[PDB]
Amino acid sequence: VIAWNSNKLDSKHSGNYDYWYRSLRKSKLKPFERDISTEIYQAGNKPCKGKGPNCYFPLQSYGFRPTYGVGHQPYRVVVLSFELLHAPATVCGPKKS
Amino acid sequence: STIEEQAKTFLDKFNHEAEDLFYQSSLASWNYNTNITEENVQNMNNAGDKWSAFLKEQSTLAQMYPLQEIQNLTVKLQLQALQQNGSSVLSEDKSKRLNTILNTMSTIYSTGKVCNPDNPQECLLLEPGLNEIMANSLDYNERLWAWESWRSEVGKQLRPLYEEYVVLKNEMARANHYEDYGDYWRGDYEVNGVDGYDYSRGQLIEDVEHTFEEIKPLYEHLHAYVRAKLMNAYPSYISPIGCLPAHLLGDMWGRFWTNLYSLTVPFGQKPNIDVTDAMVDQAWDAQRIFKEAEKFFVSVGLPNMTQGFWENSMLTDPGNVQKAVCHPTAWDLGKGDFRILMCTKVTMDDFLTAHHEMGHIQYDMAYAAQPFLLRNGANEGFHEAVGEIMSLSAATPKHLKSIGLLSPDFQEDNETEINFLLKQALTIVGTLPFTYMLEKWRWMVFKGEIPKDQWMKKWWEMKREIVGVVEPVPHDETYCDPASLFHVSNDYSFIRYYTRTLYQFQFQEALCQAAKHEGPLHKCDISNSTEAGQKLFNMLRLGKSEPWTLALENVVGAKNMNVRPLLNYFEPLFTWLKDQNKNSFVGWSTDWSPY
Fold it and tell me: Quick check: A71 and B336 CB within 8 A?
């Protein structure tokens, strides 16, 4: 897992609402699964038909600002996933000559 | 999905936008205080209106969750805090009338002016002139004249609005499922649903009365000593057995008695311990003071200050380029953006104020782990208590010698200790009975025991019975004296000072038991002690997720408030007061000036 601070790159005045995160979902996500569904999360037995009681938007925006603390600064995270399937290894490290 | 899961989902969805709007409002307030401009004023007003509308909408929408089907205390407290509509539950006309009355009272209190009888055009204002006359003047005519003018300005021209304000507040309290406004203010002290930690509103009153009765001998001896000392400074004015006049108390309202230290000092032949001259000779600045305070707070085990704190706090007066207000207050913008606005200079008072502000910021960072609805101390007095105990720990001679302000060959005698104890008593203990009397009078007014025409009479009766202040000028029922108070005219509590004093004394008695210390209690220093630091941080991080009784017992080991720490602290001063009053009259007579 690779991560680094990007306060001077992703921050913007009056809040940088370009970044969002999912906080509500019907169930947990499987590893290596991607889902960009924007359906309103139904928190009750009543059918969901719009914004209101027991119907909240599952996506929330960060709003990065340069005056935030170290714990709230934007951090770009890159995770390297290696595959070891039964196939010739086309990817290798550098070799010194 | 049960009701608890839905409530948790609602809280998680609401807290994000709540913190966002709170940070926006805090940034607007910071821009207003650092630069007073029309654009900043408009932005702050818009942010406040948006925040009020958001709170009203959230309180209206939060009524769908019942409190009877909640088994989690952290969620139940947040639901109870959200269900309180506040002033937004009243109608439009009543809300507009209440706001108009509040604005009128604020303008009357702010525009308080004292003019001379010979020159009606020659007038003065409160802060530069009236405080200087009541604090640094020895004339019987000028002080009494200024006090009478200030008492005549705020009065009969405000009671017809104050009564309607009280009626509207009672209606608002009855609309929020409360008996009266007093029970609404005491709602934070009531705890229910906890095994062995329940607390009632009457129990608080009983404990306050018991603490007052236990302090009564010490306050009586202190008042007798102050009267005996002021009798020589004002001959034929201070009664030997009667009460003391209000204009000679050293305060506009008789709250603090610190101004009388120049005339009531027992050992004025030697200067008091002051590190101002040391900082002037060493040419220090506010940056060095804040660095020393940060090192002191880190040495006890607390985390260091954040980078944004040092990169955004205005710890130095910018001058004429910015219209900044030199008013030291704690600022918590949220999301790690902690700032401090203070025009710190090279003085011991500014040193203690900076230590108090840093203690407040450390507390804010401590309870920052709790959600936005719980980002607050266990009560309205924990912050000030922590700040005061930190200031007292920093003001110790050992810490001053360690930081390099005092010489290593410095010594301390009993006279300096007695002077320091007398100063602390005049600063803190001098306002306790006045606070108790004001709070009891306001509670009885809210209860309706004094309906129409016994306000001023019973007010002065209780004042002469508890505090012992005689009227220097005959008054009547129209002169509403309590209306001139800062906290009464602006709708602020007053018992919070007594609560924070009790909490400060209890914390001073508790934390000094773990840290190694020898000698009296006022010399206790918790520096370089990780045990006491961890014991305090275990309580500072609780926030409002737990009742104040459990948080207090986790520190002092007691399930209820206690006042014996104050007696153990002032015993060295109490013995000297008894020795001085052994040959003098004790007490005060309530019969004086038969007008």
Answer: yes
